[PDB]
Structure 1
Amino acid sequence: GAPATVTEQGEDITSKKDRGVLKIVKRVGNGEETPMIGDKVYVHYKGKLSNGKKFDSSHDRNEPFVFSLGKGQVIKAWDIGVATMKKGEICHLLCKPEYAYGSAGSLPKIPSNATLFFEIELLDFKG
């Protein structure tokens, strides 16, 4: 399925080249511009655990998730991966625990040592 495909066939987008964040572009976005640090970014997403459970979905809430890019308001894999996206792009991200919730996890939903899968759509970004 999609998590296996991004694990086996995804691009390492880390600066360390440690395969901690892997990406596949699913839907090509607009032009060349990507958001910059500090921008307000608007996304839709879904998250799955490695046991196949969906743990989160913005579509199910009928409202995008909004954050300031590159400020540690989200797990590192998101600050790294969203920064690579064009407006309108949809991508898959595979997030090793060092770029997510680590050995702590995040009670109740995220276990210790969790690899996470996301599908993310960048809706918009504004200075």
Structure 2
Amino acid sequence: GVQVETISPGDGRTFPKRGQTVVVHYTGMLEDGKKFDSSRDRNKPFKFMLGKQEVIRGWEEGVAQMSVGQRAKLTISPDYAYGATGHPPIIPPHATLVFDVELLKLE
């Protein structure tokens, strides 16, 4: 599944719902800390629609548990990420992923 650990608190009140668009900054890392992707490096927040299945399951279910303004560490099992096949060569088979996610706003 996905484990959500707070880095810094959000408002504690505004949680995203299915169909809403979330705006986030994120960094994705493998278990040894290697970064594989980051919106901060592009200086461009990332948007996705909750429930559209346009991101991996853990990032979706994890952000659903975040409030606006929160920054959190999401640890995601491979079955909630890229599974047995992965995303070669950047994501190996059966990889647990760690994302640092900041929920900036809902649209």
User: By how many angstroms is 1:31 displaced?
Assistant: 3.9
Find the counterpart in structure 2 of residue 37 from structure 1.
Answer: 18
TM-score (norm 1): 0.81
1:17-32 equivalent positions in 2, closer than 5 A: 20-32=1-13
Report the AA paired with residue 100 of structure 1: A
2:86 maps to which of 87, 105, 110: 105
- Larger mean Cα displacement after TM superposition, 111-120 or 22-31: 22-31
Which residues of structure 1 form unaligned runs of 5+?
1-19
Percent identity (aligned) = 50
Deviations 1:81-103 (A, max 9, x none): 01111110000010000100000
Deviations 1:10-63 (A, max 9, x none): xxxxxxxxxx21111111101412011010110000011013211111110010
TM-score (norm 2): 0.95
Deviations 1:84-123 (A, max 9, x none): 1111000001000010000010123111000000100000
SS at match of 1:91: strand
The reply on whether 1:118 has 2:99 as its aligned counterpart is yes
1:69 maps to which of 47, 50, 56: 50
User: By how many angstroms is 1:125 displaced?
Assistant: 0.6
Aligned Cα root-mean-square deviation (Å): 0.9
**Higher relative contact order structure (alpha carbons within 8 Å, sequence separation ≥ 6):** 2
1: CA distance, partners of 2:10 / 2:102: 9
2:59 maps to which of 61, 64, 78: 78
Find the counterpart in structure 1 of residue 72 from structure 2.
Answer: 91
Which residues of structure 2 form unaligned runs of 5+?
none
Divergent runs of 4+, >4 A = none
Q: Which has the larger radius of gyration?
A: 1
Count of aligned pairs between the two proteins = 107
